[PDB]
Amino acid sequence: TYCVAMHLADGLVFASDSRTNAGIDHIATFRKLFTFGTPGERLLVVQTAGNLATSQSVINLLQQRIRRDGASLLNVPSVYDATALVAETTREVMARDSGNLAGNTDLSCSFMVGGQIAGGPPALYSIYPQGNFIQATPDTPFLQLGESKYGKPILDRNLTFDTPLEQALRCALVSFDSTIRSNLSVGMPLDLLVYHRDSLILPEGYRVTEDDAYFSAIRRQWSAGLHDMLERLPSPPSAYN
Amino acid sequence: TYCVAMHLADGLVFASDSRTNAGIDHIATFRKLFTFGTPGERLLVVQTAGNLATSQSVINLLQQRIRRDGASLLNVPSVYDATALVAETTREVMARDSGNLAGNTDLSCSFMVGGQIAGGPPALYSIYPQGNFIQATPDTPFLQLGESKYGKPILDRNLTFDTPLEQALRCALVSFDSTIRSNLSVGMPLDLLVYHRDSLILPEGYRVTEDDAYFSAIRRQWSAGLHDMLERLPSPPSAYN
Amino acid sequence: TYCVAMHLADGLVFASDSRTNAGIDHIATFRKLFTFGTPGERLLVVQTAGNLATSQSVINLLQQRIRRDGASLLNVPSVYDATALVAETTREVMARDSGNLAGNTDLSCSFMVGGQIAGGPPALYSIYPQGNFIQATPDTPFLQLGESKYGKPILDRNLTFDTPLEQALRCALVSFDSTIRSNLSVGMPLDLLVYHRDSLILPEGYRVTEDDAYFSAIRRQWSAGLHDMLERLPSPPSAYN
Amino acid sequence: TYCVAMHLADGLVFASDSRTNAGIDHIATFRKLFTFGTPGERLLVVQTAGNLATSQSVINLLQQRIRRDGASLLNVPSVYDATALVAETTREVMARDSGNLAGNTDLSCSFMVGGQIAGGPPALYSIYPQGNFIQATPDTPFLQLGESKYGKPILDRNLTFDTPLEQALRCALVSFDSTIRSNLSVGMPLDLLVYHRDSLILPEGYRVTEDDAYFSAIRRQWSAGLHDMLERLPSPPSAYN
Amino acid sequence: TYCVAMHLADGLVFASDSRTNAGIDHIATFRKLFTFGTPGERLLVVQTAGNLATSQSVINLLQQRIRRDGASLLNVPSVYDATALVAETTREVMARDSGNLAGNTDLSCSFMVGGQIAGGPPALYSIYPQGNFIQATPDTPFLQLGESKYGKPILDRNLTFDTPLEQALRCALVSFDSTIRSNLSVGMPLDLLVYHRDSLILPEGYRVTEDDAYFSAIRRQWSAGLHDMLERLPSPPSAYN
Amino acid sequence: TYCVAMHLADGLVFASDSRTNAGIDHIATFRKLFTFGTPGERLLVVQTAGNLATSQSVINLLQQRIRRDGASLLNVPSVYDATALVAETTREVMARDSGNLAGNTDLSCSFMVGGQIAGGPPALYSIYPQGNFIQATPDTPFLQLGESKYGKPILDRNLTFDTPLEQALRCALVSFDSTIRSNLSVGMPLDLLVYHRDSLILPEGYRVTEDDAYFSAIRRQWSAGLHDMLERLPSPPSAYN
Amino acid sequence: TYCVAMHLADGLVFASDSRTNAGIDHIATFRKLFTFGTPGERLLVVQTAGNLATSQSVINLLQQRIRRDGASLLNVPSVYDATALVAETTREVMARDSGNLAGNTDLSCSFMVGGQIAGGPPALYSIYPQGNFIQATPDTPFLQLGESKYGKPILDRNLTFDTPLEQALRCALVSFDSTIRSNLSVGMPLDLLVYHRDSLILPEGYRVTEDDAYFSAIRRQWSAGLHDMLERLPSPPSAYN
Amino acid sequence: TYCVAMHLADGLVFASDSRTNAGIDHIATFRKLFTFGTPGERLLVVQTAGNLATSQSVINLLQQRIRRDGASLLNVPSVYDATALVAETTREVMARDSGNLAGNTDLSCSFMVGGQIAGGPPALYSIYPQGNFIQATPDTPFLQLGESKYGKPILDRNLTFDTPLEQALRCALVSFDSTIRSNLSVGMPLDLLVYHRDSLILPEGYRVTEDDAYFSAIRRQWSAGLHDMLERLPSPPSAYN
């Protein structure tokens, strides 16, 4: 479980893995990036991390309620209020499943909610386990969920609000490369989605499998590159021994 | 707090940061790499991570006991037994400080113990919070303590049992570069030590400050390198949008 | 005790064994697949694993309550809510039988709940011992209960959301074949049920006995096949000795 | 962690994975198959599963003690007594590391010990977590450690005391194939060793990596085979719906 | 103490011995089969096994409470709920007699509860020492309490859901014959009751004494039969010596 | 696990199953009947039941010690002393494997030891979990180990000191028939041995597999016989309803 | 200490000795049969055996509490509940006197509680040292406390539910005769009470002393009778020598 | 288990039952009266009670040692010394079987040793569980083992040193009658032996089975007699109600 989202000058980029702890000796693939919207009016993306049961219930309720007269991700007036609604829904799920039977088992999960509603700029929020949230800004234009330390440095180094979408996406992919190599809890397939500021369309998004030609290639290249740079770095002076 | 140690064909390489959480609003510099030994007979290095009070007490008792007739890091017959002694000492410290007054505060810490005693190969162990330990091997030739996910990938990618010492050290430094950029809890100065297999001398080791010419240079180079490789990676195919 | 359920493009497939630990020196046959519904409106299937007393009580209450004005598997508005109801009922049963008299004996059990209610797609959930549940998806389209590691690989290898029902069923049967050979706790007769997406009928389902001509045949074939493939695999090179 | 050993008419075959849980967020490669002996006099193989710290300590002490006047794997008069010595050593390690500091953490591990000493037949034992052990026989000629249910069926189906070594090894590899696909805690490289009855030599053994041409090939073949056989199985009769 | 109960297509059959361990050097006769009901409305039978004191208290309270406005075996809406009530009552009794004074003495007992209440089919449950219970089904149509292994085989071999009552009873009697011969803790008189599906009458039931003409006769016949069959079985081939 | 041994006027008969609990989810085949002796001088048979590890170790030590100058099953002056030696050996094995590591796991096992040594009559003993033993006599001429209640009645009914060997063996086989049908922990193959009083030869003994023509036949006959006798028994009189 | 009670068709009969171990070298007379009740409403009898201090304290508290608003032997709704109250009281007494000071001394005692309360049949219970109790029934119509084996046979032989009260009493007296002759811990005076079913009066009861004309007479007669019968029995045949 | 022995003016009489607790759910027949001697020189009888394993071992060793140059029941100079030897042998057996493996299980047993050695009068001893013994005398001419309270009164009443043998034997038989009726742990067949003072022959002794004409007859008579005497006893006076 590792998710990244970026809010940049030209729009939004989202990327999630799929490897999921679904119980003991049951590790499995589950989509962690979900889209919602009405074409020409709004796009909203939700990413998930943490307890599967909880996050599934949250997503499921959001879907059921879309087709119902009352508060829903389709009628909510701002990305902020969408984020609040997701949190609100999370609280509701935690209230029901909590009891003596759950015991000490850890039901918490976290989310990212981003997108654009007609008449206001695109936005991106992250909701924490405890249900309070923060918003990405130009100074801090990307947010992560899950097992994210491994792939943070490459984003810190290169990403900024002005990074174009194609490059941000590339950058995200390198993030996943390192993460996947160093931590088995994170794993393919990946799910990506790029959204263009003011387009107000629902992009189809794209899934990166084990076989993906492009992703295989940039991984091979990135390895060769790092190995090269390392050998061509200078030796430490006398002093260091 | 981030420490790395490597046990390679040609010897051992150790590196630690110094930034330490010593209470609220009191972040400070403390050495996390300590050496012990008698020239021509043995070298032992201990690195620390976790609770400052605990680790300090452990190190302090190991030093006091060196100058005393009984079990000590200078008479212990093997690196294994040295590791065991450190652990033994840790248990002793935890027993004394534990009480109602400590309450729920977290007194645990972890260590690495590596080196060489005359008449057997060099070795490297890591002691866990709970006092049990593991040994580095050719298949898993480096071990980390502290805040280590950020700088793990570069080691996973490039380091192997056969990597020479000068290159392993270099590799470690890049590990610290990324870590420092992405996590404030980790910070300079760094303390390094390189030990040559069968030398049985106590290297002086070296401290890398903010001002270090060499470290500044390889950071600047590494940045330029990464930035280059990133721009010269190919674009995603049509399919990805 | 081994149960499998699959949620595929064309519908649902369920399969359970019947061998049951009913106490010490009392191993016995009990159905572990139960159906509910009203023709033209809904089909729901519940499978059971774990403590017999507990699961029986749960099923029994669900049956009694069907014929009663209030929450029941026949009036519940979605497969989700059905799953929730089963869980709710489980909690109720655990509460009552728990006491000093039970002592340390393990009263937990698990369930699968799947089916289709008029006006929404078919769905499949698995409820864990602790009462929280997950939903099968296209990326993870089958779920297991009980003693399931033995027969997992064949499903992992061949089954996907798009697998047709007849082939999924066949696949399940091979899963049971391996399981039965390698673990005595699992045993015949088996109980199967196939449901076609949007049919909204209650299939009669089918019981596979010791004598079943078809199942005997595919077991014999599958053996011969495996034995053949193994002999016709190449020899390991020189290197391997 | 998955290990298999077979004691057959023509000798012994051993195979182990290397993926090891070494702490939280620290999964790593460690050899789990170790050899000992004097050429023309004896071969002994020890495989490990369970807690890394414990098993490492046991192996380490056995190695140190080989080079010492007293009970050791090189002077022990029978494979039985070797097994007993390993167990004896395990007890010793558990006694020392046990204390308040370990707490509720699970230090147990299991071993296989097999081989041949001059003047008696080859033998194979498995030591349980609790320190008691069993011997493989003609009726039960293979033994497993670790995560073994996934790959048990293929061994149950095909393996017997009279299976030749080359075919037993092949069989083991298919066992690992299924296991690796269905459980991420098991992983390459693998380590194999084949020993010929009465040879009294120390085979070098062989390591199967990710890249291995032969293993890659039989995996590809085995997949194609299974897929074929599945499509060419008959359809269930009318009765089954 | 040995009890059997069967739930068959045509109704229920119950049979119990009477020999009871009432303390040290005090073995005695106590009825272990009790009936309750209102003619034309319900029949319930309770059988007992285990601690005399505990089971007596349970039965005694059930009787007292029948003549009292509140939950009782006469008003309870289903055989299920009757079983639950018995269990509920058992818990109550165990709570009271438990203390330091009882010490380690074993107060547990088990029950069978079967019968029919107007408007639903007949049913049969068995309650375990720990208070949870199971229901007999067509696949497992008989249940035993007490010292039951001796007489199990004849029931396993011959009894099924479709066995008529007169034959099931006969079968039960042969079960008791073997048991009584092979285990002194079981002993006559026996108590039988046969109930016809949908009759809703309280059969008087019947006691089999030492002197019973019919039971004496079938025992004599059964012996002669077994002895005959044994002598007329063929001799083992050469091979067997 | 079910073993029987008989000491009759004409000699000894031994029979054991092979199904063995070797751990959780690991049920397997292991021989439970072992022979020892020198032709023309002695025959001794040992049967085992209970913990596999313990019984294997006992048997293994007895074998090793046979080929060694000191107390052994070949030099022991009487069947009594043989039994004592087996017990003695058992104590030795329990002493070693006992420790904190075993914990509460149950290491006990039981044995039968029977045979004949030149110059004295044949004899048969049974050793209990606690190491004390009894001897079979004319009044109690058979002894059982393991899961024996199921097949006791047929032996109680028919077997006496004067039963000839061929008929005793036949009787034993029927005992196994019933046991196997009613308890899964008991299972084929079976191992038999018949020894003729004063022959002083080592019979080869015989193994009964699943496929055995004779055993299959008498099982089929015995079923038919029982079914016949049951239908031809009279009906219970009026009185019984 | 020897007490008997019988529950017969026509009522109840109680009889107790009086010899009591009250400490070392202090054997003494204490009544062991106590009556309670309100004429025309209820009769309850309590007999005691075991530790004097304990039983006295129990009786004493029951008496004090009779004259107090709350649970007492006079308001309790059934003989069952009376028995439960006695047991309850016993627990209370054992709780208080238990401590380090008592040490290993044995404070346990047993009771019989029998009688009749208006509106339900007469009943008789026996409470065990541990506080659980049993009820006498038609099949087991008498119960004993204390040193009872000596006088059990005459009761087993002649007493049944239908035995009239005058004959039962006579039978009890012979029981005491044998007991007194064969065991010095039992001794006169005796205390009797006979109660007629449905009389609901408090009989005065009667004390049998050393001097009692009737008891002396039947003892003398019984001796003469036994001596006669013995001489007029036939001689053993030739065979017996 | 119930044994009696008498030492009278005219000789000795011994009688034992045979019912034996041989383990849980294994009650069986074993001889508890054993004879030894050389005609014209000595007769010794040993009776056993208590733990089967222990008493069997004792008897077995006494038999083996008879045929050996050293202390044995045939060379021992007095009945006293014979008794001492038995005790001595018991100690030896307890020493060997005692260990951690026996645990808390109760290995004790008791014996009677009686008979006559040329040149001194006949004698009779009883050995207690703790190995010290007593001798029967004219004032206390009979001794019992096992479950003996039931049949003590008839012996106390009628037996004296001067009772002739035929009458003492008869008396013993009545003792067994009552015991058997009132306690199931005691049971037939019985074993008797009568020895005539100064005869110095080994009587064959006699076994009383279920079918014995004489014993059946005196039981029937004794019942009728007791029943008669009881009905012919006078009624209690007015006073007693």
Residue numbers in the entry:
A (entry chain G), B (entry chain H), C (entry chain I), D (entry chain J), E (entry chain K), F (entry chain L), ...: 1 to 241
Quote the study on this structure:
For experimental characterization, we recombinantly expressed the Anbu-1 protein from the pathogenic bacterium Pseudomonas aeruginosa (Pa-Anbu) in Escherichia coli. Crystallization trials yielded a monoclinic crystal form with large cell dimensions that led us to expect about three to four dozens of subunits per asymmetric unit. Unexpectedly, these 34 subunits in the asymmetric unit constitute the repeating unit of a continuous helix spanning the crystal. Within the helix, the subunits are arranged in 17 dimers of opposing protomers, distributed over two unequal helical turns. Consequently, the intra-dimer interface is virtually invariant and does not exceed 0.4 Å root-mean-square deviation (RMSD) in a superposition of all 17 dimers. This is contrasted by a high degree of variability in the lateral interface between the dimers, enabling the formation of the irregular helix with its two unequal turns that differ in the number of subunits and in the rise per turn: A superposition of all possible pairs of neighboring subunits yields RMSD values of up to 1.6 Å. We initially tried to fit the profile with modeled closed rings of six and seven Anbu dimers with different diameters, but could only obtain reasonable fits when using helical segments of six dimers from the Pa-Anbu crystal structure, clearly indicating that the solution structure is not a closed ring. However, the Pa-Anbu S1 pockets superimpose exceptionally well with those in the proteasome, revealing a relatively narrow, amphiphilic S1 pocket, in which F30 and L52 form a hydrophobic patch, whereas the moderately hydrophilic T20, T48, and S55 are oriented for hydrogen bonding to various positions in P1.
